[PDB]
């Protein structure tokens, strides 16, 4: 497992890119990063980065106004940004369905009014609210149809056909199709999680992944930003920094033992927050090639 997102950044088949991470763990950053890396690596395909965060993180990350109307980020003719408001208890799945169905209407609407078509969309999942809850209802209720359809086959079908397997066939058809919307092919859809080496973060991460696994949604990418690696930076000293990383190293080992076959890309900590297309691309380069605190130390103390 290469601690990078290369295989994904260079993938031309993927058309659904999920990006989650509750806890103000730099979700917005990772989202713009993964979107830029894929757009630059595949200039022969249109990409769309959409967020639902009411704070308009994408507009504050790039430095330009993004609305419900998809707009190409200035300087790139391959990447586009979208900031919509996904809102402007009896049956499970319904509510979630309405929410997602609405965001997709905002997608097809921006592909008709210039933009034409985006080959792969970068979903910047909301900060809170399991917007992927409906990723299980369709399989759930359906399987219930199967228990319903079969059982409704009293002794027979000898006598059931005298008073009346189209039911056992159409069920299986409505079955696969459905399971094909959640499974949505691991080569076509994937989910990228973001976090940091900290107790609470791991807790939030561990559950997030479980949730997705119950959705059968492919997950094999865990981003961990804010890492110190304070044992290599050319300008040592500062116990305060060394102590903090000693704690981050503790958990990081729990992450490398918890997710052994996962793409755990460890990102470096930057002095200030990274904003602007420029500082973003230079920081996202580490998502393609591992960050080496021994040599790439310059690039970091550069964004500062």
């Amino acid at each position: 497992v290469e601690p990078n997102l290369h295989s994904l950044i260079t993938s031309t088949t993927h058309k659904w890119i999920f990006v989650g991470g509750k806890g103000g763990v730099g979700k917005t950053t990772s989202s713009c990063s993964i979107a830029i890396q894929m757009a630059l690596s595949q200039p022969n395909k249109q990409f769309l980065l959409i967020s639902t965060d009411p704070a308009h993180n994408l507009s504050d990350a790039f430095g330009e106004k993004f609305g419900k109307d998809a707009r190409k980020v200035t300087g790139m003719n391959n990447l586009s940004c979208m900031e919509i408001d996904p809102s402007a208890g009896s049956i499970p799945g319904i509510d979630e369905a309405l929410s997602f169905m609405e965001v997709m209407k905002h997608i097809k609407r921006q592909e008709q009014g210039e933009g034409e078509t985006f080959d792969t969309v970068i979903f910047d999942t909301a900060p809170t609210g399991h917007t992927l809850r409906f990723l299980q209802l369709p399989n759930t209720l359906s399987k219930l149809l199967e228990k319903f359809g079969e059982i409704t086959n009293k002794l027979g079908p000898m006598l059931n056909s005298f008073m009346g397997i189209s039911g056992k066939l159409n069920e299986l058809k409505a079955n696969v199709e459905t399971i094909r919307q959640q499974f949505t092919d691991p080569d076509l859809t994937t989910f990228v999680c973001v976090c940091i080496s900290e107790f609470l973060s791991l807790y939030e991460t561990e559950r997030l992944i479980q949730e997705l696994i119950s959705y059968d949604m492919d997950v094999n990418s865990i981003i961990v930003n804010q890492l110190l690696f304070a044992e290599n930076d050319q300008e040592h000293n500062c116990k305060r920094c060394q102590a903090r990383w000693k704690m981050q190293k503790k958990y990081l080992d729990q992450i490398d033992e918890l997710y052994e076959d996962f793409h755990v890309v460890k990102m470096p900590l930057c002095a200030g927050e990274i904003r602007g297309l420029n500082n973003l691309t230079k920081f996202s380069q580490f998502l393609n090639k591992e960050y080496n605190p021994i040599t790439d130390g310059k690039v970091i103390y550069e964004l500062e």
Partner: protein, 291 residues
């Protein structure tokens, strides 16, 4: 998910062909546990089963055995019902098991128990038994094989006649009552589960081999479609053959007359006859000891 499982499965069997058994086993289980935690049983089942296969193929009974148990646990956790697919997975794993595996019997029991809980068979699925029987026989667990074969399929019946025939042949000093000790097992066991077809076929195959090897004095007696290979030096075999047909008539009189003529045999198979008399003649009165 489907494209991810397939991939990792190679990096697993890669750690196995490399020697990294611990790595291969530890990684797979933790990952498998994850699927189970999310109730994605189906995924875990294929992963676990596949992992167990490779381990057993690499002569790693330790890991192989462990995974089998883990698979079964899920089987009961996913309430996997007994059917072709469900049985097939276990049959494929049983084939790679080493007849000397210190867990053999345990593995077998677990699988069969599962078949019992998720099927209408009080003792487990027939087909499954056919495989289990052969495995037990490979570890010289004859008595255990006999039982399973008895409750197996048509092939089991053949492997049960071979199990009894290869045993009879193993006897250095054969005697008139020796051939009965083996042959009788076929007649009684099958008659208990009321499988007249198997009782007749197992009988024919065993009696014909006995004639082509020992060359005993006999003469086939035919009457109204039925045949009784009358052996001139094996009364035990004659009695046993008549007992079979008698049960088929379910007529009290015939059962009593047959026993009264063979008083000795009636005391040797006391308990056995008592049962047959209850299952085929509705007799509640115990069996009065002749001797």
């Amino acid at each position: 998910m489907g494209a991810k499982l397939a991939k990792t499965l190679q990096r697993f069997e890669n750690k196995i062909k490399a020697g990294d058994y611990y790595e291969a086993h530890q990684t797979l289980r933790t990952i498998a546990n994850r699927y189970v935690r999310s109730k994605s049983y189906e995924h875990a089942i294929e992963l676990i089963s596949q992992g167990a296969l490779s381990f057993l193929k690499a002569k790693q009974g330790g890991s192989g055995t462990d995974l089998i148990f883990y698979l079964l646990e899920v089987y009961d956790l996913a309430e996997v019902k007994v059917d072709d697919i469900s049985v097939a997975r276990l049959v494929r794993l049983i084939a790679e098991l080493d007849p000397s595996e210190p867990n053999l019997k345990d593995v077998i029991t677990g699988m069969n128990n599962w078949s019992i809980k998720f099927s209408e068979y009080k003792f487990g699925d027939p087909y499954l038994h056919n495989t289990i029987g052969s495995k037990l026989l490979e570890g010289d667990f004859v008595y255990e094989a006999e039982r399973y074969f008895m409750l197996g399929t048509h092939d089991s019946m053949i492997k049960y006649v071979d199990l009894l025939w290869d045993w009879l042949c193993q006897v250095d000093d054969i005697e008139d009552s020796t051939v009965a000790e083996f042959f009788s097992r076929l007649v009684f066991n099958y008659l208990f589960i009321s499988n007249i077809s198997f009782a007749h076929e197992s009988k024919d195959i065993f009696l014909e081999r006995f004639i082509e090897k020992f060359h005993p004095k006999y003469e086939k007696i035919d009457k109204n479609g039925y045949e009784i290979v009358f052996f001139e030096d094996y009364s035990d075999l004659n009695f046993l053959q008549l007992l079979l047909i008698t049960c088929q008539t379910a007529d009290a009189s015939y059962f009593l007359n047959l026993k009264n003529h063979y008083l000795d045999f009636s005391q040797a198979y006391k308990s056995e006859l008592e049962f047959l008399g209850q299952e085929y003649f509705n007799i509640v009165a115990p069996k009065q000891t002749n001797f």
